[PDB]
Design a protein around this ligand. Structure first.
Ligand code: HEA
Ligand code: HEA
Ligand SMILES: CCCCCCCCCCC(=O)OC[C@H](COP(=O)(O)OC[C@H](O)COP(=O)(O)OC[C@@H](COC(=O)CC)OC(=O)CCC)OC(=O)CCCCCCCC
Ligand SMILES: CCCCCCCCCCCCCCCC(=O)OC[C@H](COP(=O)([O-])OCC[N+](C)(C)C)OC(=O)CCCCCCCCCCCCCCC
Ligand SMILES: CCCCCCCCCCCCCCCC(=O)OC[C@H](COP(=O)([O-])OCC[N+](C)(C)C)OC(=O)CCCCCCCCCCCCCCC
Ligand SMILES: CCCCCCCCCCCCCCCCCCCC(=O)O[C@H](COC(=O)CCCCCCCCCCCCCC)COP(=O)(O)OCCN
Ligand SMILES: CCCCCCCCCCCCCCCC(=O)OC[C@H](COP(=O)(O)OCCN)OC(=O)CCCCCCCCCCCCCCC
Ligand SMILES: [Ca+2]
Ligand SMILES: [Cu+2]
Lengths: 49, 534, 55, 128, 98, 36
């Protein structure tokens, strides 16, 4: 009989790990999807200047 | 009878009076918000003809009625007076006769406020009554004088109430209740009373300085005479930032108690919870001038106030995580108080992130005196303190009154207020980032977009309030029939997995406070022989 | 001194505490007459102030 | 054993059942359990479980079967009434500003476009 | 430790003098993070027979089915406990169809 | 543990992305439907 233990422990770990990973994409899409797009269109008008 | 209500000494009757005054002022103050939203629905003066006065006056009345006449008498005077003696185990308060004057000086303030509004001038100065605009040359009537007198009455009520709670907690506990072993709500009330005691006198000094300067010719803040209108800002906000914590700390105890009863597991790390609760109160006295970033302070003091205000997030975050850790493993019961608590956990964290975003002095030069700040503090006030007030009512009312409230008709109210308030207060952050200022009755046309959406959402919340009033009526009338039919839920804790239905009916309440063991409604003389703990 | 004989009077009186002393009638009756004038006279000037007539 | 009529289908029969009548069944059920099992009748084993662990008295759910749909319809009705009542009160209001004509808003753009109002982003000023 | 855990609830169940205590101990044994060993469950079955409560013995496997978290480990507990369960007479929930 | 956790975890992330997109992305509906 396998001593099933710590089901909560790793379930806790994955929950916290996913939260940072899912929050990682949310944070990363803001920086490199939206915010980085804003900088490039900003620089183009200044580049023509 | 006159003797029972005019000569009250019983603390529970004073709590009922505090509650009754809170709802009337709550309805009065939430109609001015309706008129404000109707005036801001579209560009141009639509309902109020052209009067810029009677708009600022309505805003002042709304703010004062919501803060000093709804939240203060309900959370502190309503719940604190009724529940602190019962959970501690005291039969009543230490000073039972000044507990009555702590209440009866509140209706006088309402008379002073209404007669201030009815005088031809009015008080269009904001809830922060700044000296030069509210001086005798710009506000020349007896209006703001009467408004100041109301603040003195509320201050004396709060001070005499705060002195009562400190002595009551310190030496009226039962035979086993060491100061180390207290319910968290009592801890919140204790810390709130200590903040009030140390913060009220400075407000009284500043307000009396303003009064004497208007009528007694003292160059306290008059520019011609060496006075400084910025000294008033220091004096007022020294009571001002600590104040935003008197209105949320008793809101923390309610959430702490709610989430550990409908989730059948005790709070994760209680001693750290009380440490964090005390640290927020202690350290909030060191951050008051973040409300004065653009007033022209030194560069080095701005760095200090920026560094000290971010430390607030360290204990606060501890409370957010420890609330998410006491619900991880337990069994969750999705009732109305639990739905309010779960909504609070999300909306208050949304408000706090915007708050930490506002805490940086270098960024606040773009977000100050805009609707960004309004959207911020309407999350922690209208969704952080109001929600815990609704959760506390739905949590304790059947025990206090003895009348149930038709669950399915209350969850509708919860959803309506949720999706109504989110509509009012989420678009504000969009209006604030484009630079829409505060305290204006009419705005440039380009701002007409989100204002219409926010105005539509106010009617939803007003309808939810009307439904709540009907719920009150249906609770007081034929409320004894609600627990006979299947309209309401009777037990706040379902039996455990291996607990039979015939054994749950000999141990009905497994609670960690004396409140839910008392008869419904509690007796006038609750404790003859003192209760014993541990 | 008189405390012992005043103790026996205040206890076993079955009257409100402000009416127990035999000399209390001298303070209470003139007080309610002046008190009524104090809390009713300012309420008469309220409508006069709302209209704006200064006396 | 116990009479066949009483035990059979003692689930839908638990509610709408006299209190004194249902207190006699548990007295009989208790005595027959103090006897070696595998001798109990099948109707009884489904009866003792339901009384102990059924959905009656306590363990009744927070919401009944039809309550979830009632709350959904009630919430949607509240949104309809709020929006409908919003338009009625809007009729008893003042006239619009003279600058919301969509020809004022079109003319606002020529001023902005000549001054180069927004290089990244727009200056459309049109919301008619 | 797990062996200390098993040997101390093996003693708690042997001392349970009423139907309130048996339902109190089993609510403690299944309240821990670890799934109990099959030696623990056997003693719990004996306790229910001692206080004469059939429905709590049925809920033992119902508690285990949600607790064991594996479809083969429930069969693993099933096989070793066939002799004691059949001897006692406890029916499973699926077999009972209540 | 990979077999058991997969049956429950991955569907929830998809449900997760839906609700959060509703609470936060609702004003995008009003602007598109008729910014007009
Ligand atoms: C109950 C009321 C309440 C509460 C609780 C707060 C809480 C906070 N408030 Fe404030 N505030 C007001 C009511 C409140 N406030 C009002 C009414 C005004 C305007 C008054 C006026 O001008 O008229 C105001 C204005 C105001 C200003 C001045 C803005 C200006 O006028 O320009 C600032 C400046 O920093 C501020 C910051 C904060 C911070 C940092 C917190 C912190 O306590 C928040 C901390 C929260 C979090 C940190 C999120 C939760 C924590 C976590 C999720 C853990 C993870 C966190 C991190 C990793 C950081 N708010
Ligand atoms: C507790 C404090 C509180 C509450 C509840 C509210 C509730 C609301 N407020 Fe606000 N408001 C302030 C405190 C509050 N407010 C302050 C301090 C200012 C600054 C004033 C100034 O600039 O000088 C302000 C300013 C302010 C403005 C900006 C004015 C300006 O800057 O010019 C607006 C704009 O729409 C607004 C609207 C609303 C609306 C629509 C509601 C409500 O419709 C939102 C939904 C809430 C309810 C409907 C209340 C429900 C609860 C009850 C009625 C109590 C009964 C319930 C129980 C006992 C459980 N108020
Ligand atoms: C100011 C206060 C404003 C709100 C007042 C609300 C009120 O008075 O409610 C009365 C009543 C309470 O209900 P209950 O708690 O007995 O549960 C009834 C049961 O759940 C459903 O009963 P039934 O299935 O018969 O009704 C379903 C209902 C669904 O629609 C709605 O709820 C929105 C209209 O349809 C109707 O009843 C249509 C009637 C024309 O509900 C109603 O009848 C609401 C009608 C609007
Ligand atoms: C919107 C479309 C919803 C589709 C239906 C759905 O998702 O679930 C069905 C329920 C039941 O809808 P119903 O058939 O009107 O309810 C009758 C009573 N029940 C069946 C609940 C016992 O649907 C509901 O209860 C949802 C009601 C939604 C009301 C607003 C619709 C706009
Ligand atoms: C979430 C719950 C609902 C939140 C509140 C939604 C309010 C929608 C709204 O106000 O839309 C009104 C606009 C009107 O169209 P407009 O382009 O703004 O033109 C001006 C017309 N007035 C305003 C003078 C009448 O018309 C629209 O743009 C209607 C869009 C409706 C989109 C669906 C609802 C929101 C998403 C769910
Ligand atoms: C400001 C007012 C004074 C506050 C400080 C004194 C409060 C502490 C002493 C105290 O408890 O006595 C009070 C009497 O003073 C008073 O409160 C009477 C003076 C009231 C001044 C009103 C202006 C209330 O005593 P208690 O009568 O409430 O309870 C009597 C129980 N044996
Ligand atoms: C949110 C988005 C907007 C939703 C709008 C809903 C309109 C009304 C519908 C009512 C339907 C109904 O009645 O739902 C009933 C359901 C199912 O209940 P049941 O399983 O007992 O079955 C009932 C039949 N026997 O219970 C609930 O709601 C409980 C779940 C609530 C969860 C928390 C709600 C509060 C918000 C918290 C913050 C967000 C958390 C997540 C953040 C990403
Ligand atoms: Ca208008
Ligand atoms: Cu502050």
């Amino acid at each position: 009989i396998a001593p099933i233990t710590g089901t909560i422990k790793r379930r806790v770990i994955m929950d916290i790990v996913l939260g940072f990973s899912l929050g990682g994409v949310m944070a990363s899409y803001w920086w490199w999807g939206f915010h980085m797009d804003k900088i490039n269109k900003r620089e183009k008008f200044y580049a023509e200047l | 009878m006159v003797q029972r209500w005019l000569y009250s000494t019983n603390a529970k009757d004073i709590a009922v009076l505090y509650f009754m005054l809170a709802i009337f002022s709550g309805m009065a103050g939430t109609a001015m918000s309706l008129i404000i939203r109707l005036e801001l629905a579209a560009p141009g003066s639509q309902y109020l003809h052209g009067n810029s006065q009677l708009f600022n006056v309505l805003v002042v009345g709304h703010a004062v009625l919501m803060i000093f006449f709804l939240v203060m008498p309900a959370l502190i005077g309503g719940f604190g007076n009724y529940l602190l003696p019962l959970m501690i185990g005291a039969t009543d308060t230490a000073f039972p006769r000044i507990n009555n004057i702590a209440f009866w000086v509140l209706p006088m303030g309402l008379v002073c406020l209404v007669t201030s509004t009815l005088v031809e001038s009015g008080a269009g100065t904001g809830w922060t009554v700044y000296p030069p605009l509210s001086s005798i040359q710009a506000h020349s009537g007896p209006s703001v004088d009467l408004a100041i007198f109301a603040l003195h009455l509320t201050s004396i009520s709060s001070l005499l109430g705060a002195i009562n709670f400190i002595v009551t907690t310190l030496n009226m506990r039962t035979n086993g209740m060491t100061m180390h072993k207290l319910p968290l709500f009592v801890w919140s009330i204790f810390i709130t009373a200590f903040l009030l005691l140390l913060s009220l006198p400075v407000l009284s000094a500043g307000i009396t300085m303003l009064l004497l300067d208007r009528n007694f010719n003292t160059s306290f803040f008059e520019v011609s005479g060496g006075g400084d209108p910025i000294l008033y800002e220091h004096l007022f906000w020294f009571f001002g930032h600590p104040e935003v914590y008197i209105l949320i700390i008793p809101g923390f105890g309610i959430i702490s108690h709610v989430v550990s009863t409908y989730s059948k597991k005790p709070v994760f790390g209680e001693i750290s919870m009380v440490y964090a609760m005390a640290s927020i109160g202690l350290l909030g006295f060191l951050v008051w001038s973040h409300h004065m970033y653009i007033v022209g302070l030194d560069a080095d003091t701005r760095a200090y106030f920026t560094s000290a205000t971010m430390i607030i997030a360290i204990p606060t975050g501890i409370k957010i995580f420890s609330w998410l850790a006491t619900i991880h493993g337990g069994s969750i019961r999705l009732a109305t108080p639990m739905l309010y608590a779960i909504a609070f956990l999300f909306l208050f964290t949304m408000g706090g992130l915007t708050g930490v975003a506002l805490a940086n002095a270098s960024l606040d030069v773009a977000f100050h005196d805009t609707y960004y700040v309004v959207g911020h503090f309407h999350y922690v006030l209208s969704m952080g303190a109001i929600f815990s007030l609704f959760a506390g009512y739905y949590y304790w009312s059947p025990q206090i009154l003895g009348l149930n409230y038709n669950e399915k008709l209350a969850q509708i109210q919860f959803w309506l207020i949720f999706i109504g308030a989110n509509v009012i207060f989420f678009p504000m952050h969009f209006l604030g980032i484009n630079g829409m200022p505060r305290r204006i009755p009419d705005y440039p046309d380009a701002f007409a977009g989100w204002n219409y959406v926010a105005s539509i959402g106010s009617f939803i919340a007003t309808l939810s309030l009307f439904l709540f009033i009907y719920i009150l009526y249906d609770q007081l009338v034929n409320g004894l029939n609600n627990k006979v039919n299947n309209k309401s839920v009777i037990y706040n804790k379902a039996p455990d997995f291996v607990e039979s239905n015939t054994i749950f009916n000999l141990n009905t309440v497994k609670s960690s406070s004396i409140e839910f063991l008392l008869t419904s409604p509690p007796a006038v003389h609750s404790f003859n022989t003192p209760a014993v703990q541990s | 001194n008189k405390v012992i004989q005043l103790q026996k009077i205040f206890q076993s009186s079955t009257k409100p505490l402000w009416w127990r002393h035999p000399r209390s009638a001298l303070y209470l009756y003139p007080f309610y007459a002046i008190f009524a004038v104090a809390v009713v006279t300012p309420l008469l000037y309220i409508p006069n102030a709302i209209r704006g007539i200064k006396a | 054993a116990l009479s066949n009529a009483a035990v059979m289908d003692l689930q839908s029969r638990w509610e709408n059942m006299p209190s004194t009548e249902q207190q006699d069944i548990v007295s009989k059920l208790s005595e027959r359990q103090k006897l070696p099992w595998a001798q109990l009748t099948e109707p009884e084993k489904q009866a003792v479980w339901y009384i102990s662990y059924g959905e009656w008295g306590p363990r009744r759910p927070v919401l009944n079967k039809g309550d979830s749909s009632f709350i959904a319809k009630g919430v949607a009705a509240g949104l309809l009434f709020s929006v409908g009542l919003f338009a009625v009160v809007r009729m008893a209001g003042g006239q619009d500003a003279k600058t919301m004509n969509k020809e004022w808003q079109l003319k606002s753009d020529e001023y902005l476009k000549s001054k180069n109002a927004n290089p990244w982003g727009g200056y459309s000023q049109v919301q008619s | 430790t797990f062996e200390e855990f098993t040997a101390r609830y093996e003693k708690e169940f042997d001392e349970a003098y009423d139907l309130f205590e048996v339902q109190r101990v089993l609510n403690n044994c299944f309240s821990y993070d670890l799934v109990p060993a099959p030696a623990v469950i056997e003693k719990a079955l004996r306790a229910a027979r001692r206080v004469n409560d059939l429905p709590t013995a049925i809920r033992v496997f119902e508690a285990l089915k949600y607790k064991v978290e594996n479809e083969d480990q429930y069969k693993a507990y099933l096989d070793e406990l066939k002799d004691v369960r059949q001897e006692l007479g406890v029916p499973l929930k699926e077999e009972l169809f209540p | 543990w990979v077999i058991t956790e997969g049956r429950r975890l991955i569907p929830e992330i998809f449900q997760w992305s839906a609700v959060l997109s509703v609470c936060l992305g609702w004003p995008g509906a009003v602007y598109f439907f008729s910014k007009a």
